[PDB]
From Swiss-Prot, chains A, B:
Cofactor: Cu cation; Zn(2+)
Name listed for the protein in its UniProt record: Superoxide dismutase [Cu-Zn]
Residue window of the full protein shown: 32 to 186 of 186
Gene behind the chain: sodC
Organism of provenance: Neisseria meningitidis serogroup B (strain ATCC BAA-335 / MC58)
Functional description taken from the UniProt entry: Destroys radicals which are normally produced within the cells and which are toxic to biological systems.
Cofactor annotation remark: Binds 1 copper ion per subunit.
Subunit-level organization: Homodimer.
Keyword annotations of the record: Antioxidant, Copper, Disulfide bond, Metal-binding, Oxidoreductase, Periplasm, Signal, Zinc
GO cellular component: periplasmic space
Catalysed reaction, written as an equation: 2 superoxide + 2 H(+) = H2O2 + O2
Residue sites binding Zn(2+) per the record: 73, 82, 91, 94
Length: 155, 155
């Protein structure tokens, strides 16, 4: 029971770059996401499972935008609302925020209690945003994650 | 339905100092700890529920040691080993590590899936360590948390 996801920093122009991996394992309380990332900006970053198994950029109003190919937050139960990892009426893809230390590394594992089986995340993508995550659609949509900084396709 | 815990930086020499609060609420997946702290060193900090409802120091080897009055990690099931928040044979008091940002503040909530009711944690203390937490007794005991930096009594 384990999936090692290769994660890359997104740059539609200069090119993407490997920043490490995120290993997903099953615990008695839900899926555990264990990062081993580097070269990221210090702080808390929005961390979610997105609908499409793609990290490719997509054209948006005449602008090749990073990670748009991944689609929106994975929401199989139609919550149509961004929320907490422990909130039942929030996107099923809403994970705890990722902590990146001063040295640009992330190794602190986080639990997603609503995700129970590894197979459930296969066929999707995992996204790391430039901004944080206040687990609400206010004052900013999707927790204020904003732009997509890094991404990995979940095989 | 919440418990607001007053947290203080421990200073046996010149007196404990207020650093904020930690609010505990219940979710359908366990107790949620929402910090609102400031003045702490940046980084990940060991965060656990300790056995005694006291944050006072105790004499050990002739040294008045900060927070020893709280005792060890709360372990009502006698796991006798430090582990993950989602690990059943680990101290019940083992919580996810606390994230302190560059500006010394901590506001990111964390979930303790093995803790179900607010009353279960009443009569104990919550501790913040100077070091982090690798959720193991290897290579360092108690996750490498080391000295006790801040603490609050849960009522
Ligand atoms: Cu810093
Ligand atoms: Cu996202
Ligand atoms: Cu502790
Ligand atoms: Zn969401
Ligand atoms: Zn412990």
């Amino acid at each position: 029971a384990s999936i090692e996801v290769k994660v890359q920093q997104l740059d539609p122009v200069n090119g993407n770059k490997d920043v490490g991996t995120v290993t997903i394992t099953e615990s008695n309380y839900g899926l555990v996401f264990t990062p081993d990332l580097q070269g990221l900006s210090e702080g808390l970053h929005g961390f979610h499972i997105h609908e499409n198994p793609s990290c490719e950029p997509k054209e948006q109003e005449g602008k090749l935008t990073a990670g748009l190919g991944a689609g929106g937050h994975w929401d199989p139960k139609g919550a149509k609302q961004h929320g907490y990892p422990w909130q039942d009426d929030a996107h099923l893809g809403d994970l705890p925020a990722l902590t990146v230390l001063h040295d640009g590394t992330a190794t602190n594992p986080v639990l997603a209690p609503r995700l129970k089986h590894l197979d459930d995340v296969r066929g999707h993508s995992i996204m790391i945003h430039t901004g944080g995550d206040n687990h609400s659609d206010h004052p900013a949509p999707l927790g204020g994650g904003g732009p997509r900084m890094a991404c990995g396709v979940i095989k």
